[PDB]
Amino acid sequence: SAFITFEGPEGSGKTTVINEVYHRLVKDYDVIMTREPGGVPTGEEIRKIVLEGNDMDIRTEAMLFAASRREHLVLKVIPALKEGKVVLCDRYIDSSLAYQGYARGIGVEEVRALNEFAINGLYPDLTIYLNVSAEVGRERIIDQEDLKFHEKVIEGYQEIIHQRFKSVNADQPLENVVEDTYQTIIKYLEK
Ligand SMILES: Cc1cn([C@H]2CCCN(Cc3ccc(C(=O)O)c(Oc4cccc(C(F)(F)F)c4)c3)C2)c(=O)[nH]c1=O
Structure with missing residues (x-):
């Protein structure tokens, strides 16, 4: 078994990368693709609070991402x-950090x-960081804020990245x- 997480900003091609890598790995491994909350009922109920209300305090939001992360880990990832x-997981602890x-x-x-309280020692075995420049990322997405x-x-991910991390150059063509x-x-x- 292996717990592999994928990280990156928007425009890094993360969705395409995970899907394509899943289609190739399934030939040789029993693999699943997931993201939080990933269908876990409690996590889905938390997601509705975060999305359908209530123009939220940033610390309350962080604790809700962490609570959804634990439910997804315990009910989906660990089993x-x-x-x-x-297990290919789209975003984990590092997304909350960044x-x-x-x-x-x-x-x-x-x-x-x-997040260490939420994951209780369950760090990914491997974390792929899709290292896209802000400029290429900006182009893949398509205001100042x-x-x-x-x-x-991106600046946050750089600070975090500085052992389980493998940086992939995401400025290259997606293939x-x-x-x-x-x-x-x-x-x-x-x-
Ligand atoms: C995992 C993680 C991600 N992000 C960012 C990444 C970029 C997109 N951002 C907006 C965004 C976009 C779409 C959705 C949707 O799923 O439709 C969304 O909602 C949730 C996503 C995951 C978990 C929860 C739940 F509430 F359940 F925790 C709600 C938030 C969220 C953080 O900021 N911190 C983190 O830890």
């Missing part, structure tokens, strides 16, 4: 790993402590991003 599956910790300004260390937030997210990500994963799985 799949017990069946010997390769978005809530860095970009939203709570502080990475405060958000880290919150959105652009600045996109840049801060190459897919190939580099697939090769990184197979090297880890076959080791």
Whole structure:
């Protein structure tokens, strides 16, 4: 079994990369693709609070992402790993660190402590960081506030990334991003 997370800002080609890598890995491994809340009822109820209300305090939002993360881990990820599956997870602890910790300004260390409570030692075995420049990312997506937030997210990921992390150059055409990500994963799985 293996727990592999995928991280990156918007415009990194993360959705395409995970889907293509899943279609290639399924030939040789029992693999599943997931994201939080991923159908877990409690996580889905939390997601409705976050989305359908109520122009939220950033710390309350961080705690709700962390609570959805725990429910998804306990009810979906852990049982799949017990069946010997390769779990491909779109966003995990690092997204809370970059978005809530860095970009939203709570502080990475405060958000880290919150997330360590939520995951209780269950760190990914491997984390693919889709390293896109802000400029290429901006082009893949298509105001000043959105652009600045996109840049801060990238800045946050850079601070976080500085052992389980494997940075893939996401400025390349997507076929190459897919190939580099697939090769990184197979090297880890076959080791
Ligand atoms: C995992 C994670 C992600 N993001 C960002 C990434 C970029 C998109 N952002 C907006 C965004 C976009 C779509 C949705 C939707 O799913 O439709 C959405 O909602 C939820 C997503 C995941 C979990 C929950 C639940 F509430 F359940 F925790 C709600 C939020 C969310 C953080 O900021 N921190 C984190 O930890």
